[PDB]
């Protein structure tokens, strides 16, 4: 909207507070939205039984179409935006802006993938509150989207051309960050929750659950298949809840057409790390922290005092 | 496919509680939902209420309301009715009924409303 | 409260004959309707479950029909076992409120 001439800048995508505030927006959305049939939340905070918190309600069938949000000033404050087309969300900007609003976001929840969100305008880039740390997730965002199609028949269909062409930009990102001797492998989720160890979204008001296996199954940068990836899905209704800790439970799907196709423009990943002193990184699927995904699209934005 | 094994006849003071049991056998009872019905001589089937097996949650008819509790110990695959505040025409046969809901364990549930497993039925007369 | 009431109260049909049974419901409920048998001193049995799907075990002779608030249980040639009572059930409700008509006699004509 107007750019700040001569204006340095110092962002930090890790402590937003918009994230924040998107989040608990989502929250609400969510439950005017997409009501569950049972919900189970646990409360133990005596000093012996627990009393899990049960609410039985109407769970209409409904379709769940995220729409996009612009987020403007709150009373009080402005929003300023970094225009460097590569910034790492965590330092100087030196080129910066006053916007009245944010673009249009999806608030897509998901997990693994990012999907429908905003692409790079350079190069492939990742973002990491703490590289070293193993245990810190690392936010990847793409240059080209690749389409992702699935269906209620249970399968989620991803060109292999295009997907190898994306994990090959991931790892050489990724070997330019942990070092360019380092061969780059991607593996399975390690384990956890079903909506963590799959690629875990909502199509047509339905849970998808989609083994990823088979996109992250390959080593790069080590030595000198078919058409499609074709992921077996299933549609669940009793699904644990990414609002706080508790259980959801929703009833049968149905349509017997539900189809969506979305473009993937990020992934969650994490790195394995550990003593080990030989020269190969691990990374695999990642995301269940909603907030994650929110950054994905705030690292640029920032709310400040007027 | 389940049996449903049911506890011996029960006589009861109205005022007294009751507690029936059903032994599930022969499946996996967390993919199971059971149901408790009951019939009193020369009438017709009324249903009491089912719990989630799964869930751990159980939803009662109107009428029954405050009185009646459905437990299920999974460690022992036994379903339990529990019917306080007896009168003398909470007199009838209960039955354990029971449906498969798919791979439970796997976030499958099609919350079916409908009984395929039934126990032999549990004669409770309540009278002075 | 959903309300099912069965018609008639009792059947009386000639060995090998056809029998048609009625349920109606005080308000729609869809599909989620079930057909039970019993006979004195047993458990029921479901025989229909959906409006119209039979359960395992069944005969083909049996047959649920309707949608909505009406239904049929047909028999169409009925056998020595086929004599009993019969129940519908609706459970379209949530909260499930779930609830019985007041059965069907089915006896033997002489």
């Known amino acids: 909207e107007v750019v700040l001439v001569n204006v340095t800048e110092n962002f930090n995508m890790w402590k937003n507070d918009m994230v924040e505030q998107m989040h608990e927006d989502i929250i609400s959305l969510w439950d005017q939205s997409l009501k569950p049939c049972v919900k189970l939340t646990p409360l133990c905070v005596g000093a012996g039984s627990c009393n899990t918190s049960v609410i039985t309600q109407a769970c209409p069938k409904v379709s769940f179409e995220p729409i996009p949000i612009h987020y403007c000033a709150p009373a009080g404050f402005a929003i300023l935006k970094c225009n460097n087309k590569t910034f790492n969300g965590t330092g100087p900007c030196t080129n910066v802006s006053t916007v009245q609003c944010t673009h249009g976001i999806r608030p897509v929840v998901s997990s693994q993938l990012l999907l429908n969100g905003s692409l790079a305008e350079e190069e492939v880039v990742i973002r990491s509150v703490n590289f070293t740390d193993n245990a810190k997730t690392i936010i990847v965002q793409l240059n080209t989207s690749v389409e992702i199609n699935c269906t209620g028949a249970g399968h989620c269909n991803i060109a292999r051309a295009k997907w190898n062409n994306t994990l090959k930009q991931i790892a050489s990102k990724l070997r330019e960050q942990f070092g360019n001797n380092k061969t780059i492998i991607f593996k399975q989720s390690s384990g956890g929750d079903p909506e963590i160890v799959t690629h875990w979204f909502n199509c047509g008001g339905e849970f998808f659950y989609c083994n990823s296996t088979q996109l992250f199954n390959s080593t790069w940068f080590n030595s000198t298949g078919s058409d499609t990836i074709t992921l077996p899905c299933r549609i669940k209704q009793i699904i644990n809840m990414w609002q706080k800790v508790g259980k959801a439970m929703y009833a049968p799907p149905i349509s017997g057409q539900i189809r969506c196709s979305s473009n993937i423009t990020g992934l969650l990943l994490t790195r394995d790390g550990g003593n080990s002193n030989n020269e190969s990184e691990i990374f695999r699927p990642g995301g269940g922290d909603m907030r994650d995904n929110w950054r994905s699209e705030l690292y640029k934005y920032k709310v400040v005092k007027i | 496919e389940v049996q449903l094994v049911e506890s011996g006849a029960e006589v009861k003071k109205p005022g007294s509680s009751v507690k029936v049991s059903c032994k599930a056998s022969?499946?996996?009872?967390?993919?199971?939902?059971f149901t408790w019905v009951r019939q009193a001589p020369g009438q017709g089937l009324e249903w009491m209420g089912r719990?989630?097996?799964?869930?751990?949650?159980?939803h009662y008819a109107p009428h029954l309301q405050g009185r009646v509790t459905i437990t299920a110990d999974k460690s022992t695959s036994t379903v339990y009715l529990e019917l306080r505040n007896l009168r003398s025409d909470d007199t009838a046969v209960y039955f354990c009924?029971?449906?498969?809901?798919?791979?439970?364990?796997?976030?499958?549930?099609?919350?079916?409303?409908?009984?395929?497993?039934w126990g032999q039925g549990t004669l409770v007369t309540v009278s002075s | 409260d959903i309300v099912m009431t069965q018609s008639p109260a009792t059947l009386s049909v000639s060995p090998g004959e056809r029998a048609t049974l009625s349920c109606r419901a005080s308000?729609?409920?869809?599909?989620?309707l079930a057909w039970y048998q019993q006979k004195p001193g047993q458990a029921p049995r479901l025989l229909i479950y959906?409006?119209?799907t039979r359960a395992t075990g069944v005969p083909a002779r049996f047959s649920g029909s309707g949608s909505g608030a009406e239904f049929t249980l047909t028999i169409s040639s009925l056998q020595s076992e086929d004599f009993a009572v019969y129940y519908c059930?609706?459970?379209?409700?949530?909260?499930?409120?779930?609830?019985f008509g007041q059965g069907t006699r089915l006896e033997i004509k002489r």
């Open positions: 009924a029971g449906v498969y809901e798919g791979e439970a364990d796997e976030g499958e549930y099609d919350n079916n409303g409908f009984l395929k497993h």
């Open positions: 059930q609706q459970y379209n409700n949530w909260p499930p409120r779930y609830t």
């Open positions: 308000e729609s409920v869809s599909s989620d």
């Open positions: 719990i989630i097996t799964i869930l751990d949650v159980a």
């Open positions: 022969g499946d996996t009872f967390i993919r199971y939902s």
């Open positions: 959906g409006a119209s």
